[PDB]
């Protein structure tokens, strides 16, 4: 929350291999083309410091939206008006977890896996920064959501008494992003001799949409998270993988 930005803000400025340093040359060449992202190799985090990756491996849902605001304070040291929140795309290679053995222990942990993509969906809209006004008080405000944990985790407040939820979203001043909703099937060479091949459903953020055609072999690095819609049991949730960084092969 505090000062973990500065422990990451020094990582982008000062990481350096033998002669030419990478994350101030990958951040500059992705602004002139107007690409607005960054690609962190995850082996270079733990070579520079181990205490940073200790926080990121334990509780990733609350720290990656802190690194996204640690980039957009550095891109104002290079460009000098509209610079949005940057997106963090990461990739690594530790050990593949097969799709069959995903226990109840891997809830909110960085997990990579593999498989074949069955289907896609149509794009959508999620809100990032919206503007609210009350109906009676007409007291304007601005809620900026940046975290992503699909239904509702951050909603409207109840007072600025007035009525039950007096708040209106104003559609004339906001910003929006995209979502994609894939599906992923395990590779048939890890044969289910008495089973059918299972599947999972992922989500994708603004810069990974429309990247992969149905029918390919991918490797996917994401957060194994959970959501509780009723769209069949008591206190039952459902699993899904929030993708942050799809490392496909050569498409061939």
């Amino acid at each position: 929350n505090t000062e973990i930005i500065k422990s990451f803000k020094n990582f982008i400025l000062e990481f350096r291999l033998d002669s030419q340093f990478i994350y101030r040359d990958q951040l500059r060449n992705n602004i002139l083309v107007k690409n607005y992202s960054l690609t962190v190799n995850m082996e270079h985090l733990i070579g520079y410091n181990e205490d940073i990756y200790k926080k990121l491996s334990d509780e990733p849902s609350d720290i990656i939206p802190l690194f996204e605001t640690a980039i957009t304070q550095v891109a104002k040291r290079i460009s000098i008006n509209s610079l949005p929140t940057f997106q963090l795309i990461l990739n690594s290679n530790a050990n593949q977890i097969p799709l069959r053995d995903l226990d109840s222990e891997h809830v909110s942990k960085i997990v990579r896996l593999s498989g074949i993509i069955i289907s896609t969906s149509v794009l959508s809209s999620r809100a990032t920064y919206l503007s609210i006004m009350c109906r009676n008080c007409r007291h304007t405000t601005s809620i900026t959501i940046n975290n992503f944990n699909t239904g509702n985790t951050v909603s409207l407040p109840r007072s600025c008494n007035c009525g039950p939820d007096p708040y209106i979203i104003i559609h004339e001043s906001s910003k929006f992003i995209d979502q994609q909703f894939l599906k992923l099937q395990e590779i048939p060479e890890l044969v289910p001799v008495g089973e059918m091949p299972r599947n999972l459903t992922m989500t994708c953020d603004r810069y990974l949409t429309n990247k992969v055609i149905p029918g390919t072999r991918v490797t996917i690095v994401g957060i194994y998270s959970i959501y509780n819609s009723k769209n069949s049991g008591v206190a039952i949730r459902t699993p899904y993988i929030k993708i942050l960084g799809i490392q496909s092969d050569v498409e061939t």
Partner: protein
């Protein structure tokens, strides 16, 4: 209202002399509304404005429309009607715009949308695919009491208004003024407009490799009802509004449906 409307209406009064040919065509609409009354005792109120003098009058207003149209069209709306009164004073009602356009860099086919093209003037094309039915829609309601004389009034507008958003009025039935009265809803004197939603998808010839088509649905109102048959090649101009709540109001996945509030639906033959 502010001075933000104040200087904004005034600059659209300088758009009556440099291209005064538009001020000619307002009289021609007032011609056919007199000579039809001369045979009994048809024309809409839509003015085709080329988006071509606006480069030669003010580049800070031409690029204003194609970036935030919910702040420059409703000023230019009321500026047209007061000029559509002071020239024609003999007889005793929106006067909408068109935007012919000289189509800008927002000429995007409906496969590439929804990301940063909210609240702009897109010019979408494709093949119409549903063709829903027509229903009327309430706008104004005039009540009348015959025990104390005078008429009354009630505005009522939905979330699919002209362009903006305001405080939504769920006006079921306005009755019971501050007296003992049984108010009466005068039909005929009230106003009703037509409403029709059609969905358009991308063309199969300019499609990529084998996938599903992606469609987008456009609302037409006040003039373009029963204009195109299903299965036609249609070019449309509108504003990429996005209404609805994304499940944040119902305290509980997907959300935020998108629409286009069309103006010019212009059939093509190529």
């Amino acid at each position: 209202p502010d001075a933000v409307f104040g200087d904004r209406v005034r600059r659209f009064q300088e758009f009556l002399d440099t291209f005064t040919s538009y001020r000619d065509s307002v009289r021609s609409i007032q011609v056919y509304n007199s000579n039809n009354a001369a045979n009994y005792n048809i024309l809409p109120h839509r003015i085709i404005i080329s988006l071509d003098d606006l480069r030669e009058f003010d580049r800070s207003f031409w690029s204003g429309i194609l970036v935030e149209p919910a702040y420059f069209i409703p000023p230019a709306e009321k500026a047209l009607t007061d000029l559509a009164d002071s020239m024609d004073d003999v007889p005793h009602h929106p006067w909408k715009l068109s935007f012919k356009g000289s189509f800008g860099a927002h000429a995007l086919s409906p496969r590439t949308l929804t990301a940063q093209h909210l609240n702009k003037l897109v010019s979408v094309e494709g093949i119409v695919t549903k063709t829903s039915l027509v229903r009327p829609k309430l706008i104004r309601s005039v009540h009348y009491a015959a025990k104390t004389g005078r008429f009354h009034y009630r505005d009522y507008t939905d979330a699919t208004t002209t362009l903006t958003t305001r405080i939504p009025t769920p006006a079921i039935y306005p009755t019971e003024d501050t007296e003992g009265n049984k108010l009466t809803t005068e039909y005929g004197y009230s106003t009703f407009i037509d409403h029709q939603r059609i969905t358009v998808q991308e063309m199969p010839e300019m499609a990529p490799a084998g996938q599903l088509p992606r469609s987008i649905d456009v609302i037409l109102d006040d003039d373009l009802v029963d204009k195109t048959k299903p299965g036609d090649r249609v070019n449309v101009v509108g504003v990429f509004k996005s209404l609805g709540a994304g499940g944040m109001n119902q305290s509980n996945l997907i959300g935020f449906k998108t629409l286009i509030l069309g103006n010019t639906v212009y059939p093509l033959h190529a």
